[PDB]
Symmetry: D2
């Protein structure tokens, strides 16, 4: 990369944001003609979620939109990343539009526009309509067409006021956890060939959705990966190369959670070489035309980075340091992940990057003073943003940063046991309390990160 140098810091137009997802915050799961999604059904199965928690109510954001918009305004957030519930706007996944569903997102988007906040809309954040799951979901040859139909509804209803779209959030997780490990909806443990089939249908769906989102108003379109960057052993050229090679490695026995398996198709129009040689029973047939469809021009690469892994001089994984700083969900704190992830992604693809999710699970409580003190989240955010600022100085084009999350919410198979918010939610009363990290972040945004 060509360095920028450390004097400028974050660019003038930098998108300081916070992020949520529909199922994690909305509730109103069975209201106003909304159709079932796979998380409604999965979360109601005994033993799938921590303490059989579910998203039936979550943060009740469907009913408490105005309060949450006021928090976004109070904290001076420039951009709000949210997902649309596919099943709320298309209860059967295709066909009849639910105008009460559309009306909710119209009220949200109007509220953002009134407050001068830039919407960043994720189309797919894991809540596949249940009607489409019954038709085989992502195993079905027609699943890309279902997604294209949804993307056309999105562009039709929201294309006037929304100029930032992300097709998919973390295919690594919804495919790997949903269909390989089985710990996420719909909870399957499928053979390798079926994981590649699902991946290929998701990637074709992405291509068709990009084509739908290009019809009409100009917009910026991205694709968000879950990334666990390899942090080199030193600044030696050879140690950096070994980390880069490990970061972008994949093979038939370890691919679904990798970066290159998903981003090489999207950005380079090719799978890793090993995909061409797999003969497993029922492998999908991957065509030149498929790869042209998948690799539609997009405007930014989304990275959701929480931590990375330290690698030795040869790219082998080092064991975690004894007593390494960690988070309430168990993950280690590895500040250099928000340097190396963006740097390596920039070097491989030469595309602008948005950090579409970064944050920390903390054991947050309301203290005797009635406040929510989260100094560990402040330290995490401070350390990670210093590393991102260094990546910008070293020539990475970073266009935005979205704190995961605006609200404490439903953390998937961990239920409500993990709190990622800069806003505390008391689920008994639905009270929002802005945490110390919210006010810390407000100050970062006001100063454009100049004082980090």
């Amino acid at each position: 990369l060509v360095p920028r140098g450390s004097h400028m810091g974050f660019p003038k137009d930098f998108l300081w944001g916070t992020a949520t997802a529909s199922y994690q915050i909305e509730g109103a799961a069975f209201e106003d003609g909304k159709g079932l999604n796979i998380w409604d059904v999965f979360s109601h199965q005994e033993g799938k979620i921590f303490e059989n928690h579910n998203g039936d109510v979550a943060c009740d954001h469907y009913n408490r939109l105005e309060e949450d918009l006021d928090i976004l305004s109070k904290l001076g957030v420039k951009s709000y990343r949210f997902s649309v519930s596919w099943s709320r706007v298309l209860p059967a996944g295709i066909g009849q539009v639910n105008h009460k569903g559309i009306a909710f997102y119209q009220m949200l988007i109007s509220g953002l526009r009134e407050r001068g906040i830039i919407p960043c809309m994720t189309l797919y954040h894991w809540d596949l309509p249940y009607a489409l799951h019954l038709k085989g979901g992502w195993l079905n040859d027609d699943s890309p067409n279902w997604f294209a139909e949804y993307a056309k509804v999105i562009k039709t209803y929201f294309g006037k006021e929304v100029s930032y779209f992300i097709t998919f959030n973390e295919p690594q997780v919804f495919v790997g956890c949903g269909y390989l490990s089985g710990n996420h909806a719909p909870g399957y443990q499928l053979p390798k060939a079926e994981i590649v089939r699902i991946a290929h249908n998701v990637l074709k769906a992405h291509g068709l959705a990009v084509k739908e989102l290009r019809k009409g108003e100009p917009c910026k379109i991205g694709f968000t990966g879950a990334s666990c960057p390899c942090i080199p052993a030193s600044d030696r050229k050879e140690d950096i190369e070994a980390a880069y090679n490990q970061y972008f490695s994949s093979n038939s026995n370890e691919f679904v959670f990798t970066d290159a398996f998903w981003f090489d198709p999207v950005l380079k129009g090719r799978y890793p070489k090993w995909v061409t040689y797999i003969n497993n029973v029922s492998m999908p047939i991957i065509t030149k035309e498929d790869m042209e469809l998948i690799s539609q021009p997009i405007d930014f690469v989304g990275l959701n980075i929480y931590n990375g892994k330290y690698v030795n001089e040869d790219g082998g994984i080092l064991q975690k340091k004894q007593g390494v700083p960690r988070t309430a969900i168990g993950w280690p704190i590895t500040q250099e992940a928000l340097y190396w992830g963006p740097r390596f992604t920039s070097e491989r693809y030469h595309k602008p990057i948005m950090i579409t999710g970064n944050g920390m699970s903390c054991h947050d409580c309301i203290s005797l003073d009635g406040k929510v003190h989260d100094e560990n989240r402040i330290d995490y955010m401070h350390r990670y943003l210093l590393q991102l600022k260094k990546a910008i100085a070293d020539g990475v084009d970073v266009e935005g940063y979205y704190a995961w999350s605006l609200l404490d919410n439903f953390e998937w198979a961990n239920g409500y046991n993990d709190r990622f918010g800069i806003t505390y939610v008391d689920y008994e009363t639905q009270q929002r309390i802005i945490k110390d990290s919210g006010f810390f972040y407000q100050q970062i945004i006001e100063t454009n990160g100049d004082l980090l």
Copy 2:
């Protein structure tokens, strides 16, 4: 029941048969334009089958048809129960017929007719076309229509020469093991509501297939259950009633492996009462019109019985006797199952019964004399047939008995480790050796079971 008396013995036109299934014997899994089925894909998944056995070749019956037809003729079998590979005749499950697939079954059926052997054709013996699995399989609202299309192909191509059809073999097993326990293809562990959805689609599929099979030539149509009869503690009226009540019991926590859950819809046009009250997330909508479709008139009830369970005077399950006679697959030998299962099924439904499968897994070997001696299978068959003969004397209308199986074959998740044949197969050479039980059965058929 109203008795017949013991003098007739087996009826003069009794169908003395043997049974197989397509995936268990055919092989040629990837030949002659045959489409994949779910067992091709499941059996190739690491750890799903004993020693990673699969049906790729099985008994190579696709190539060795003439030899197997000659064994049927040599043993004087009156009827041959076999299944058609849906994926062999319709590689995508619907649309284009594969004429090489049809040609195989035409050669089989011509061979049977030449030898004076009555074909008994199972449409579905668990090998769902993989193309339909990718569309959600039995979760898809359209799965009954897919099956109807297949049944129409069957009637169109085979209706002139085949007059005995069975729509489904053992829905208890392919739904319970395939989608609840996950030990059979496709290997899922689904919620209760999805098991009911699948069951309802299988039952509607049955109804549409009966309508297709009625178009054109007259025929006899059946539906085959897996049954584990409750054997009463004594001949006391109250002990018999308790066994009957347990045998036909079901509830929302234990239904998929039961008799009444499947046969009450097929024969009485109603589900067990408990199904009316279930509100679980995503329950299918069960209509009056659905139940009329499911309960199309059929000609016989198929029972596959290997053993039963002894119940106390109150219908509670008794613990197995210490050192109870058992089989090579681990199941107990309970001769009275082939009395009580037919008797109770006759009392509930008043329909003719065919024993569509009865037999024993034995640790068979080629002895030093080059023969296969299976006295334990002879004793099993002799004991069970005496009990069936007593059921006929006591007024059960039994129209046939099919020995499971003609050949040692692929026993599903147990691979080739369980040998049920009256014919031994050496898988190294594909040599067939008729076992002592084959000659024992030949003599039973010649004497119409008069000397049992």
Copy 3:
């Protein structure tokens, strides 16, 4: 408020902090061997070095003095003082504890000595450990060594720490050393040998200098959902309940023998093959007079008359080890234990696992631990106001340390340890606690 002579303390255990596992003639213990078995500990962590407290005694004594702690609860490594568990005393082992106790006395800090905090000598494990009929005699021999060498300068002893955990996790669930899953009869045999060992150790500790002797339970108090008499009764009954399918982790299974000289009723009706024979003489031995009941309380569970044990609240405040924060546990545990047994209570362990780290300012900020301690101590203060005799409170722990099967992944300290350098950094909670002790909790 808190009594004038209230024992404000902090607590540790030998295996969790000492290190020096294989030197100065120390014998192996079951945790040395268990922690080296693949997959038994988080990331195969072990106590070989731990906080290296064996070698950093002076630094850690200075932290105790800096924070103004009135009492220090520690355990003696049985395998350090008796390498084979019985027979030859290791005088280098004795010398370490003599240096610690001299250091405490120099600083005006009251020693509180736990004899058994789970580090069974490996030599005794090879002889069947607590299954062996002679295991109470092994423990009595150890208690006699303790009284002989430390009886002059130590006046507070606890025989056993949390038999619920070392028996239940060690021999029923198998997640703690030695990692067994034994039948019910063997769990009762082990429990009965531990309880007889306790009785024999009390008799040894009574020989010579007068002292206060206790026995420490792991307790998860039942918190009545309200102050209604009915809810209180229901909570008390649940708290002291046990049955043959769920007893080893309960209060009454262990404390009824120690304090009342009887087992719960249900023990009478177990006839399983190999059940120990429990005699009148055994129960007299177990129920030696003791001076205080030790409670280690981290949290409780909410109970009502109508609901029984209530489901945990969605998003309940919790700790880094996953446990919920239930402030009223440090009211009701002491109160109900006081009402049942009429003995003084010592809180021998209370604290919180936090995801602590060194912030960019070089400090360790643990506001969640301060809030936890503030809330729990207000509840203990209310118990004292309502007439419960509480003699002391020991913060678990002085140091971040080896948290058993969780290895170093759980930090309970009021002092942070950087394991790379062994640097100690007193956390905000340490200074918070210093201020509580200086004011005797008057400003809570």
Copy 4:
């Protein structure tokens, strides 16, 4: 053919047939306790009654006489003769074995006495069992009782049956009593104590009357791909291989100590915490001269030209317990064992689990067991023809019995037992075997 003095036998074990588990002063053993733990045995079967052979001795002796068996291999219940494992002899226990041995002598049947067939006295288990440094001395005390009471009339002794199984299944996999999953160092400690126990027992059995002493391995012979010298060498090398990750179920790990006075080289270079110290003096003790090597062989494995284990053939002939039928195992196991150790071989156990039952004719037809026995004995006869010194063959088992964790679900007998009535029905295989013995196997 077979030598004129060839020991044609059948074999049983105390816990598998005796019953009378809790009477005539018999002490508990580890199988009495393990079998009563929920879920350890198929359908919670146990040996409390088994074949009731303790009470039906005369009937079973008459079956041995009817079938013309030359030798009867049985085990002594350690807990029946020494209820606490050491100390007071139980003379009612001794009296049972004296009645058995007198019965055999009256019928001209040669006793072959197994001292240890897995029923460790429970009292010794409570003292750590084979982990205890003194476990070799406990076994020596038992062996001295055996020689004292039975040395006049018994001239064939086997110290241990299948250490591979009672150590590997008992303490590594945990599927057999006492049901543990111990670290590698503890498995080696147990193995070393068993081997020292063997050495001390041989010394006790040599005091007084002359006798033949053996040690019985569980063996799964490697069958070469062909009679090519290189294929044979590859099979031999695989058969006698072992390493730290796969040793407890091997031949060389146990037999190299007993016969060569060496462990495999890898053993002495393990430095795991708590490894036993293995001395020159220990290896001299373990490697006392013995008279025969006992092999219990049910099947083997086929190896390729390079000694790699081939996958089982699809549809391989197998038994009711799931094991394959591999006739050449009873050629190559004896041949390779003979070549490595230059000792006479006794096949102390060979037989087949079959799904036997009483047919409508009231008989028990077991043609698969006849074919198994005929095939395996032809291979043993070929080993003898090729110069292997084989002194005897013992059919496992005289009776259908308690097959350990499989309970009564596996029938290995040449005699069927109806457990409802305890009726014995000699199977077709019993009459087949009678004819083999009458003709000394000349007509196989």
